[PDB]
Amino acid sequence: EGYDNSC
Amino acid sequence: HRTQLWFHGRISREESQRLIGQQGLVDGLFLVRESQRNPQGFVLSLCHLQKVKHYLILPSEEEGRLYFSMDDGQTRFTDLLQLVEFHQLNRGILPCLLRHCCTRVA
């Protein structure tokens, strides 16, 4: 959702 | 095991954004916290190019021993401390190295 590692 | 300066426990994303900003917004400036959206794991809050990015850290269990990963289990670490010390030397999936610990005010 809002993570730079797409989690 | 975590009494480290860079660990801030249960704080918000907005709070981490303020804390990092307040401390300089320098590249490599970072903290680790508990995830509000994922209470199971942790979040590495990292400053890069004057922007704060958030990296989810998920736990897993094999053979009854806990381990952590930031890349869907592709790179695993025995403890968060190992994860941090390792990314102070290695880029991994991060845009930069972990250079500066973000602490609470004195």
Add this chain to the structure above:
Amino acid sequence: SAAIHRTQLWFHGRISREESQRLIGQQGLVDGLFLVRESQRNPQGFVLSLCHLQKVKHYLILPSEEGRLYFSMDDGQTRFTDLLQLVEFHQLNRGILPCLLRHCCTR
């Protein structure tokens, strides 16, 4: 630190390549079996001796530097603060190794 490793069970100091192969053999020649030593031929760094498929492979670990000492098995692609970190890491991650470090070979 570059001195933390010298009292670990898996650290055997200055022993020959032949001695390490014998030690691993006596320990079973099981996969993941490993020890760390100082290279007699290259005393600057260390050797990770690992057993995989009944064969003992030897991996060079050299120290390097930003004024901070670190160790590496791949010319700096993967860096470690201490040999203990390097060992703990490859118990979970293959890295440049053909398999994980499973069992410590002791003195």
